[PDB]
Amino acid sequence: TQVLNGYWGYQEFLDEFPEQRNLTNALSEAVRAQPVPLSKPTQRPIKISVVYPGQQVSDYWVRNIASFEKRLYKLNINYQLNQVFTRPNADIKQQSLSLMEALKSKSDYLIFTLDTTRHRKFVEHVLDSTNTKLILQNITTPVREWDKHQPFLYVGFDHAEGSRELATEFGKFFPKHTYYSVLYFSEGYISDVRGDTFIHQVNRDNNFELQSAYYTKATKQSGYDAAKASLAKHPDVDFIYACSTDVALGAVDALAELGREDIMINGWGGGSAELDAIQKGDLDITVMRMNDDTGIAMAEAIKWDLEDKPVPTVYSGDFEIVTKADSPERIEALKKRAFRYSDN
């Protein structure tokens, strides 16, 4: 069985290149531990450029840069940081003009958070035609096309890893042949790696039987609609697996309306809305990102590079399972860990 897909899985990559697993594990350990300052001072401050999407309602990227900068400081790395923002709805010509700002700084490291398919020309230009070291965020599955020359670092919270942790928990709690339904994201990548990964594992390890599955429009409304449609046609399920936050919270409302709170349901990601729902007992389980890990990891990778140590190609931040049985003390402790740098 050889899937002919253009990306390495995260675990697949670490298995194909065993030394990469050792490097990734060392980075994981350094990220959790207290800072160990740079042991090889630089003659000048390093130049870093970061490309973020503008006009974001969430503070995900604000926290990310806060965590990155704080770790650099605590590691005694002198730097000059240039931030570059693209307009999400602008066309490709306009965004590519904005990205010139990232090249004008003549960076030693360029951190890039935008989609690498849409902006493939830019990222391949950085790899093929510049002397900066490219760090990609929101991707943990190395591009096979770049096998001969990979970016300096890929970071993110791997979708398959998070989904497998959820599959393991569902597998422990429910007996073999348990009936379940799945609410996907919209058709595409997220549904493939969060949804079909989960289905594959619980079917293989626990013999669970999928009763129904629905693609959604990735909104609370569509998750609500899909849950109602699913339960009208397939009421005899013990849980629903949801691939995203808003979809899950829509299904939660559907469960309350139908008086089917006996059906267990998960979140995905563990943000503030989910954790509120967990504490109310509206969501039964979720997988929570330790947000600040990726910002800290990028700083540690740079440190190792400045110390002439080998740096892993890929890194996925830590996840923690959270359930409605967890105490408020436990959830607060997880929040403080996830935001250990970006808070305050």
Partner: protein, 208 residues
Amino acid sequence: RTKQQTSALIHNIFDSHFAAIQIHHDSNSKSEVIRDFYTDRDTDVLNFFFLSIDQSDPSHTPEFRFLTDHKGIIWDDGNAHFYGVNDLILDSLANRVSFSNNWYYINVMTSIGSRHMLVRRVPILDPSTGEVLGFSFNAVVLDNNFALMEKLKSESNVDNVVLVANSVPLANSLIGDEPYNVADVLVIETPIVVNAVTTELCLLTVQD
């Protein structure tokens, strides 16, 4: 020097064969006929439907197809049988292909020899609710694929071509009355690479 342009041409013909089948598979899977089949299960209406699409573009059809719901296979077109792909092997193919919209290379033994296949699935959707009713599978069988070898030779204007997997020939375009046979060929080697995944497959072309 000129080994490069020949390799790129035959790999483009190879890719275009599967891209065309992929495009039909996606479009056929949106069809109202297949969706209605999940309810009434009328094999005669379904078979006539697939006969008509294959008529228009005969070269770009799969060697076999089958449909599943979430429990298992509910229909196959009957073509798998003579390839040695029995019902238990079909069930295994359905289990192995666990992601949609992606070709899988599968090399599996049967009672009548090894079968080297490219297989993919697409979800069958209810356009109004988003329900996944099940999956549609398409399989290309590479072994002794007369039509495919003939198309690779014809469109690349080379004299002949042999498909190989780990130095064992799977198919060839040789008519039979030429100065050489397949074993003698085993001039240009072209590894089959799909989405930058290296496979055990190789295309051997004869230009001299």
